[model samples]
Target: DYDICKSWVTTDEGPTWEFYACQPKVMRLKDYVKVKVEPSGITCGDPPERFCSHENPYLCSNECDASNPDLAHPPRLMFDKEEEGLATYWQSITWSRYPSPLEANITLSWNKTVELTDDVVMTFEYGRPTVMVLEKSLDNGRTWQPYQFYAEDCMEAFGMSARRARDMSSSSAHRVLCTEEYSRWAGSKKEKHVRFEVRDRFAIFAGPDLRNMDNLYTRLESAKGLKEFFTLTDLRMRLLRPALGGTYVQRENLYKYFYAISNIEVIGRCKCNLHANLCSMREGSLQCECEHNTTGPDCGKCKKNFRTRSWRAGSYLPLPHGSPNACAAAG
Candidate 1:
């Protein structure tokens, strides 16, 4: 349905290529993402430390060492594939240096802009943060905007009422809300996921089963900031506070007060401005395979010698097949 061109048309003028509105396919974004954790030395294992337990606070046994190959828990482990039995994670040092806030900024970047098509789910190994912010950057990390907030107590932590993505209506579908869904303490291993609910938001217009995607696409084209709401070049997770095991942090043991992330799933496709049906790596960078006589990283502008009728992105209207607002010849 999103094909750029199906076949050549035979007419009085012989054959000419026929084009349609198109876009790239969605992919698992974690594969192409570059992750960087800030507040240097936040990662565990550097100094070969022992982590304490929530159940048995004093008896510490888990060892993390940078020098040891099997014991090392590096940032790359967060994006690596995991086997069914083993759980690999990127962990932070213990809260031994408590009294001072334990904050970590985890930034996941894709050099090219992409439109998210599914939920952004993050899996934590030990415990999920009690408070965190999910942010997005469109200009390659030059600027940032909060996409969602997660907290155990929204009013107590961020002074806002908690809102769930599933309860949102069409008018407020794109609004950022503080959610208490993923941050509460429901046991360490029971609830270990923090999510940015893209599917829920999509269901606002597409129905509960997402069977009416045409309506969603229509809403995307007509709604302002709605399309941009799903577009991002980078994502940053600000882990403001660690999970305190459902209670106040006890000074007796600060070993369990840290963040351990096992996976971050970002499902999206390149923001090719609807001119290209595919995206490929070219010159060491992922780029839109431009079509419809379009050029530029996003197929945002007309080619060098095309008609100067002002450039416009391919339209996502008149369903079944959209209009490919292709550039014309300057004859």
Candidate 2:
């Protein structure tokens, strides 16, 4: 037997609203039984292009498609041009945790090999009172080289020190779009801005290996009273290639234990002719926005009515006839 209840309501201005209510199902001990349900993989319809390959099913299945380049299919690259490369694919690793107050090390690797050239910077995001050690490999996960700490004297055996500041919502910061404005909603008048004790906050450690030693050493030495200055716990994210294979973290701590990683992103340069500022990075190419009458994938040539007969390569400029007024108007 079953019972159902219904209700109705209407607004004075006009529309009617109706809804139903139901009682909880209470079962007897004899009627309750455990049921096992096995997970079944969903089937996808065949597409014009081939799906993922059998050898690389987990990572590349959907990446090869024409839809878009994402974390799966990374964008193309342009190297040796800029110090900061374009961001292509971003993949976050799952958080790992453990028990007790002791040293905990963790490693996150790629499903396949990636490309790395020149000097690659590895940035680590994490929490505090912990020493963090970084080791990188270029030999497809075979052997890893330990990165030296920037501060050679502070404590190299331990790692870099890090911690997180108090978390606050961006909404707490007010935005004024115009001088004159009004809103029907009531805003919270008292903004709570509490200051906490000074300690090490979230830090980013960059390396192929300690090229930035002087500055990093200064930072570690400054945090003296803080416990085990190099111990790192709150690691949030990263974006880089593990080309030869991967990177790993070693946490040295005597005060606390357990560790976790929320995510990791892999970034590379977009291989195209673009004003570093005007290019939008995507899978396969750099979406370029040209200025000064420039056009094309690399923004290499002049557009219609624009001339560059005597223009020097690598340095761009408008033709003599392309007036300053026109440039101002383009803005």
Candidate 3:
């Protein structure tokens, strides 16, 4: 398992999960799965700091909402490299209505069944929304639940990017400060509590400190028998509407709706026998340990040895044998 979450400081404060990331074990639905997105090839905000930089007035302008400039402007989402001179990374599936319709229809499914032995949490490195919808199907394609509201508009970029609040006297002022830290160029230990919120949608600051990913989570603890959740089935994400009218810093002073999704994570327990589990979960089938000079998938046969004989040499000086080398002599 990799470091799923990290704190600002280098200490035993970050939460760790048992997730197999390196490529030995089985790649079943319960292990490794595939993802498919319809209407693909619509990704933007590459070279993160360049395209979504706070210094770039044109890109940073156009607040999603006019009243909330601090929460809506660009520098929307950024993942900075801890190393020097390395490029910061930012990406999202965006859809716009000004020049064209940029929308995303993504699906993630598996070839086999995957049982969820624990709660599943999804991390949207960037792009927190209140209108997005996520739906799941259990019986492959037999049925589907209603499109439930999936994310809350918890403007994380403004809240926890290492820029402390400027004023903490008023709750509104403090929140505004937290939500406005995205403009600076930019993590820690000791289990620090980084509080941030937008319109009452609260979120905690845990995970990597490089300003890119947000450790937002949704609890799926009550999803019983979630094994069939993605078994040869589909989990779709859809966003079909444009943002409200607002003036942006574009050359044409146009207004457009923006959407982004940098990363997604599915955390759960694995269902493979310890004897069959490999160093990595890339293999496609269950395997057994080979031993006693034996080899094969099941380790049930001898590799190279004699056979078909009974011995009593030391007992009465008489040795019992059918053939000294039955197969060998015949050949």
Candidate 4:
């Protein structure tokens, strides 16, 4: 459970290295985030905008002006450390171009790869989108695939039927299911979260309490490409349609139809391929502080001098502390 290089031995050849199947610690993904909202001018306030919500629908008194520091809302607010009673957010321009479908591709990139270990959550200020799709890219956003679907109505919005955590089993734990859990109108108290449900999928094998890590790790490894489901270099929230009082509607009064995200939570770690205990953001990208005669961005290959044996990933096979499978030196 601790770092991989926890213990060492004093041998006849003096001090030497030890190994285990270890990895980098889990991290808060916000501080390391790089955000980009697509489709040209997606953010509100460039020309100043007035938007409202169901809570204050008719009185669209709120102003978003990028020129004013006190009034403007930028994408950086999505990752800010806001104090209590103060909520900063990134607001999109009102869907005044009604019936055209106000869409925004809000993407978060890490530059380096990371494997998600917990829920990826989005907190919306006014309301969550009625229709959205979460996509992940393995190749730094050059290509993408659907991670999950979110809509008020699964069948109508997405072609797939609606599903919940209650509907899935351990065998189909990581399957991409279009969920309608957070699409509906949630009152001021409860309706802010739009989650990717990474932990819930993990809990399928580990159980809700998640105390059975042995089973959890085994299932992830044995499930054949299941572990790849949570690994990505970038994540995108494509807001297909904004909210209309928590339900799907093509209202002409589009002032109330906009997207506002207060925060996004992605708890994950740099993928060090089990040879590294720590990964740090250096110079501009995340790099593994490699051990085990390993080299490369993710400790993926053998060092130049340690080329006697082919590189091998550390293993979690023996359970508890697994095998290092470290590189070997010819000389």
Candidate 5:
């Protein structure tokens, strides 16, 4: 018999049902991540699909034992950096097409940007010096090309650099501020709330500069296509400085400087500005792209509230409560 291993399927439940293999412990159906046992370890000379291996007994152990195996490795999910407290995580805000470029608030929810405000952090990370590839989507989160959105000269000149570390207690990083109870409304409904928790004062490490980078530019004119836009600049970084017994940054000014580093790859995929779920192909698209909140692997489902009245008019019509709706009747 083949050992199914620690396989699982996530429905519209919570992260609690996340498969034993992947991260995002609890997930809803729209965000469901399903994991099944792949052919691993020694095969007992049987049909590959029907073979059984006992190396990692959990691969074929009893259901109870399989479910309770000790978690030795970090979770596979990109955003669930549980060890470093999820509070420090930053969400990129996409440019809003709803109001258009002419409209107010047009931005993507990228972790790359720093508000230049009170919350000045370079990265929300932990453990083994964090490493990431810099990339961006001009079209909103439909696609992620290389770090091409930034101008060559602009990046070459000064993407983001900082000075050496300083004393924690001697500075004011710890006493910056904390506003955990900031509540965000999901929609017109007052009952729907997205809570923004206050974060403990902390600082992200700033690595060294690039090796073959050039000077900053005036306008991003030379950078035409995404390919031409992402040439390596002079910023070769090896690792971040030690948090030094949990203490990261001591000065707020230094923290903001590192936080400004852009054009780098980040953890967890960014949601599309239009669909919130779909990953964009490039900065912009000829087709009407879905927002990150929406768009799925299959491309039909988007995040809730994303579908406007005209978009769903055919499916959600004003039919009599007792009468069958067009969707049911058609089915």
Candidate 6:
């Protein structure tokens, strides 16, 4: 039988709290379980929307549905204009980990060209040492929340095994309200102080890649030293889509992966800090955690074959270790 006990509670009005200790079953021996605990009504910000899509699932899923859009589902784009071409309007500011590490905030502003309306939509992509957080804004950029424009409830519907509820709370950081007080919650010294202007709609920031990993690199690129692992671990939890089991440390280190860190190569320089856990492995293979979707003995390769399955496009499923390296020649 599972043991249930009540303990001290800490909150606005300090109420009683309970803790549960469920004995492991024989079939579940040696298995480390991740339990999710959150206060009731612990709602945060509103969910953001996915600004663009390479393939419009709506049109393909139900052509007869009333929610269909004109030829172009998302009328205009921020990155490339051509099919899946990324828009070039983005700014990435690197945060220094020197004196005191700072979270690099890459704000991507997407603006639609039309007569000025009272409302505007803004998109954003961000990350920390380990987690890449992407979010969006509407209502003239007053409130920004996690953008799930194209994602469904795969994390909840499926199981977010190692996903910490703490990281889910960080998704709200990528938002922007575009109002007079941009960083009211961020305090005076920390305020971004950007005001809402007469812009139609826009997104902010660009990272190592336009894909999910790029956004993550933008957030955690500056992380270094022992705290690096802390950032990396959080990044794995928040970014990397959602792995059903095993964490970045256990699963990534034990296997010889395929992809050589998806976005690491594109940034031109290897994001491998000297303090990373790199070790020489068999056959001249180096072992270090690849920057993004990194695989292999020492993070030598990148991860491919990971399919998108969450509200964001980063959630991936692994293929056989020895499967074909499909993206070896792809740009």
Superposed on all Cα atoms, the candidates' RMSDs to the truth, in angstroms, are 1.5, 26.1, 19.5, 1.9, 23.5, 27.3
Q: For residue 286, give model 1's deviation from the true position in Å.
A: 1.2
After superposing candidate 4, which stretches have Cα over 4 Å from the reference?
Answer: 53-57, 186-190, 246-252
How much lDDT does each candidate structure score? 0.87, 0.25, 0.30, 0.84, 0.21, 0.23
lDDT of 4 by residue, 123-226 (tens): 99877888899999999989999999999889998899989764678778778889988885533334788998888887888888998999988876578777
Output the number of the TM-score-best candidate: 1
TM-scores, one per candidate: 0.96, 0.21, 0.36, 0.94, 0.19, 0.17
lDDT of 2 by residue, 157-232 (tens): 2343321122212221111111001100101111111111111121222122545434333433343422122121
lDDT of 5 by residue, 1-331 (tens): 0111122556667332211111111112112212111123111112112111122132432111112223111112222333543222211111111122111111123321111111211222211111222233433345554321111122332353211122222133222121211111111122211111111111211112212112111011122221122211111122112111123332321211111111122222322111222233343321113322233321235345544421210110121111111111111
Better of 2 and 6 by lDDT: 2
Using lDDT, rank the candidates from best to worst. Answer: 1, 4, 3, 2, 6, 5
- What ranges in model 1 sit over 4 Å off? 53-58, 186-189
| Model 2 misplaced regions, further than 4 Å | 1-101, 111-113, 116-126, 148-153, 156-258, 269-331
Candidate 5 residues lying further than 4 Å off, grouped into runs, are 1-68, 74-131, 137-143, 146-331
Better of 2 and 4 by TM-score: 4
In model 3, what lDDT does residue 253 have? 32
Cα misplacement distance, residue 143 of candidate 6 (Å): 0.7
Q: Measured by TM-score, how close is model 4 to the native structure?
A: 0.94
- lDDT accuracy of residue 209 in candidate 5: 28
Question: Which sections of candidate 3 miss by over 4 Å?
Answer: 1-31, 45-56, 59-96, 99-102, 117-121, 139-147, 151-233, 241-257, 270-331
- Ten contiguous residues with the weakest lDDT in model 4: 182-191
Question: How big is the positional error of residue 67 in model 4, measured in Å on the Cα after superposition?
Answer: 0.6
| Preferred candidate (TM-score higher): 1 or 6 | 1
Best by lDDT: 1
